[PDB]
């Protein structure tokens, strides 16, 4: 049902830092008993981590905001009694565009890329159970996937958290990759400090554009929520040094951008450095902004007029004309010609939108 929730005390997240968690496996090549340097979108060490709560004291607190999904995220959740049960991925989160829904009910995890109409306040509920109050209809649908669950029954009550669940979500080449690790913890009110490596879980082919995401929470329903918390981090392009063992599992890693000591370790390709003075390189000031500066020409080149002529030329008397002071937009001919031959020699055809030429000549004939 499409029902708003009442009695929540606003969304106000706290912040923390993730010491060494979030290391996963780049690419898919098998490696064992070696040290490699890899460039990829990792979660940098000691990066700020958004913290959200879910508890009742008799003011309720349910944190399900809409967050950005840029280059992938890190998701961790210390939990007791399994309040967190799924996520929503998409770009507009309505009927206009397709969205990805990951939901775990009492026995199975249900994944389907579909065209949902989500409500203002999506959430699940359980008495006994009474769930699926997050959408109204989905209509045209593309993908479906059911496998073994990750989360446990929503019932229960204790005094301390018991399990920590970590997830890494990525979206490359039309593939939704998921990495996970499940560990038992006895922490009270914080994210644990330590190193974690996440193994591949699924490789769902979705083929959708994902920019925004949100979490799905479970209420007990005059409704109450058991104590739970989840943490959000953002991946950034870094260079990491990873160590593989004989099983092909990562056991240690260093972030080559954290500090000068990690820089020296990454430069020397070793996890330990002897006493002395070492020449380091590339202190990792990686750029994060891209700028473009182009001239003030705005009128479009007369490709339609050139291609629309009644007669072109004879091949022995081919006509040559110069094109200048315009914008070369080949997309305006897509409804007219459908070029049967398009071959470029000095440039790549995909780089034409990024290039500016001093002068251009056009030769026309019919063969």
């Amino acid at each position: 049902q499409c029902v708003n929730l009442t009695g929540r005390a606003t969304i106000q997240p706290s912040f923390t830092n993730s010491s060494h968690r979030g290391v996963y496996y780049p690419d898919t090549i098998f490696r064992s008993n070696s040290l490699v340097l890899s460039q990829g979108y990792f979660l940098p060490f000691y990066s700020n981590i958004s913290w959200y709560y879910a508890l009742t004291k008799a003011e309720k607190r349910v944190d399900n905001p809409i967050l950005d999904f840029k280059d992938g995220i890190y998701f961790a959740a210390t939990e007791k009694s399994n309040i967190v049960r799924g996520w929503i991925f998409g770009t507009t989160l309505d009927n206009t565009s397709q969205s990805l829904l990951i939901v775990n009910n009492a026995t199975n995890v249900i994944i389907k890329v579909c065209n949902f109409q989500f409500c203002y306040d999506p959430y699940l509920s359980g008495y006994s159970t009474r769930e699926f109050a997050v959408y109204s209809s989905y209509a045209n649908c593309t993908f479906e996937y059911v496998s073994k669950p990750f989360m446990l029954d929503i019932s229960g009550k204790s005094g301390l958290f018991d399990t920590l669940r970590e997830f890494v979500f990525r979206n490359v080449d039309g593939y939704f990759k998921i990495y996970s690790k499940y560990s038992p913890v006895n922490v009270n009110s914080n994210l644990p400090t330590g190193f974690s490596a996440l193994e591949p879980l699924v490789e769902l082919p979705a083929g959708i554009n994902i920019t925004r995401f949100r979490t799905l929470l479970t209420i007990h329903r005059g409704w109450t929520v058991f104590s739970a918390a989840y943490y959000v981090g953002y991946l950034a392009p870094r260079t990491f040094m990873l160590k593989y063992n004989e099983n092909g599992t990562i056991t240690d890693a260093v972030d080559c951008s954290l500090d000068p000591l990690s820089e020296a370790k990454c430069t020397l390709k070793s996890f330990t450095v002897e006493k002395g003075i070492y020449q380091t390189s590339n202190f990792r000031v990686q750029p994060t902004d891209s700028i473009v500066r182009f001239p003030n020409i705005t009128n479009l080149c007369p490709f339609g007029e050139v291609f629309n002529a009644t007669t072109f030329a004879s091949v022995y008397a081919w006509n040559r004309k110069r094109i200048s002071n315009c914008v070369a937009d080949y997309s305006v001919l897509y409804n007219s010609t459908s070029f049967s031959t398009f071959k470029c020699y000095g440039v790549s055809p995909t780089k034409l939108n990024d290039l500016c030429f001093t002068n251009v000549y056009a030769d026309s004939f019919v063969v």
Partner: protein, 50 residues
């Protein structure tokens, strides 16, 4: 001798080594990546031999 060696090492950066251009910037500007790998590899081999 030492100064001349360093100066020659610097001046060797303008060699094409068989690529379209010796400037790395105007290879990634004009060529799509999988086609640009060939030129980049030639430049890497030459500059690594130097």
């Amino acid at each position: 001798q030492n100064a001349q060696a360093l100066n020659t090492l610097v001046k060797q950066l303008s060699s094409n080594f068989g690529a379209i251009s010796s400037v790395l910037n105007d290879i990634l500007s004009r060529l799509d990546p999988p086609e640009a790998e060939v030129q980049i590899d030639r430049l890497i081999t030459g500059r690594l031999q130097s």
